[PDB]
Design a protein around this ligand. Structure first.
Ligand SMILES: Nc1ncnc2c1ncn2[C@@H]1O[C@H](COP(=O)(O)OP(=O)(O)OP(=O)(O)O)[C@@H](O)[C@H]1O
Ligand SMILES: [Mg+2]
Length: 280
């Protein structure tokens, strides 16, 4: 599809599910139908890897993901921490109560504090789950919905670390790579998630990439480097927002706006209007 669907229409057309974030439109070609596509982050799809050549729509998808999550979940249950090294676009998400912080190049201390905070949660969750005899993240999410449970005082729910621009991240923060690897491989059992974009899959090493259970792939510089399959060869050139994912169906990512406008024009202004509208 060429014109992106705005989030207000995607949310409205979607059958909502806890920890389902609607993201765009999936062409399901056997029958002629085109439904709302999203990600289930409640289980093994909880970590997400995003690949694609320059200007293909990686940062916009992250904006759409966070806005979509924030429009359909409470800030008590979903929190995002953002490391923005992919164009600066994540800053316009920071006034959402779901977003605990957006860190960029101009404040390296915050990039370090953000990773350290994700580690603190996962590492507190490990002790908490044992001491409170919590059998699974699924059970932990239920217990937190009961205000009489000791665990319900945890202000955190499912916590997502977003890294837009992996090679620049490892390039400027080499010692944080190992900490993020540990979050990706151990976090999901404790409700700690990792979401990473990269221009090339080869720059996102196995030991991290293998723990991103949902891969989303825009048009690649080298189709031989796909993390999906040969379907990626079908993505049209110069169509930002066109992607493929694990179900091997073409996708058109929607836009992070709520004003009914089917384009990515004037998006900075529309994102803020969306955040305001989400305040409901
Ligand atoms: N889902 C979409 N629908 C329509 N147009 C889009 C979509 N996503 C992105 N675009 C257009 O493509 C442009 C580049 O998008 P974006 O900044 O998301 O690319 P990127 O993958 O983050 O690139 P880079 O690696 O250079 O940061 C956007 O400014 C927007 O105008
Ligand atoms: Mg970008």
């Amino acid at each position: 599809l060429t014109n992106p669907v705005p989030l207000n229409e995607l949310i409205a057309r979607d059958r909502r599910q806890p920890l389902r974030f609607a993201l765009g439109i999936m062409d399901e070609p056997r029958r002629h139908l085109q439904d709302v596509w999203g990600v289930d982050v409640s289980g093994a799809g909880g970590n997400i890897g995003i690949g694609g050549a320059p200007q293909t729509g990686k940062s916009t998808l992250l904006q759409t993901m966070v806005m979509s999550a924030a429009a359909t979940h409470s800030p008590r249950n979903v929190q995002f921490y953002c490391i923005d090294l992919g164009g600066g676009g994540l800053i316009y998400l920071e006034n959402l109560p779901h977003v605990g912080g957006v860190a960029n190049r101009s404040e390296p201390d915050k990039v370090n504090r953000v990773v350290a905070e994700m580690q603190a949660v996962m590492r507190q969750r490990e002790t908490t789950f044992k001491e409170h005899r919590v059998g699974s993240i699924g059970m932990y999410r239920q217990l937190r919905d009961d205000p009489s449970q000791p665990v319900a005082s945890d202000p955190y729910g499912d916590v997502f670390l977003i890294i837009d621009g992996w090679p620049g991240f490892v390039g400027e923060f080499p010692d944080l790579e190992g900490q993020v690897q540990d979050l990706a491989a151990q976090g999901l059992a404790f409700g700690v998630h990792v979401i990473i974009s990269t221009p090339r899959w080869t720059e996102l090493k196995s030991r991290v990439r293998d723990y991103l259970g949902t891969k989303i792939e825009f048009r690649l510089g080298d189709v031989n480097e796909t993390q999906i399959d040969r379907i990626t060869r079908e993505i049209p050139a110069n169509r930002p927002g066109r992607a493929v994912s694990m179900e091997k169906h073409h996708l058109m990512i929607g836009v992070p706006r709520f004003d009914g406008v089917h384009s990515a024009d004037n998006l900075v202004e529309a994102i803020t209007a969306g955040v305001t509208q989400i305040a409901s």
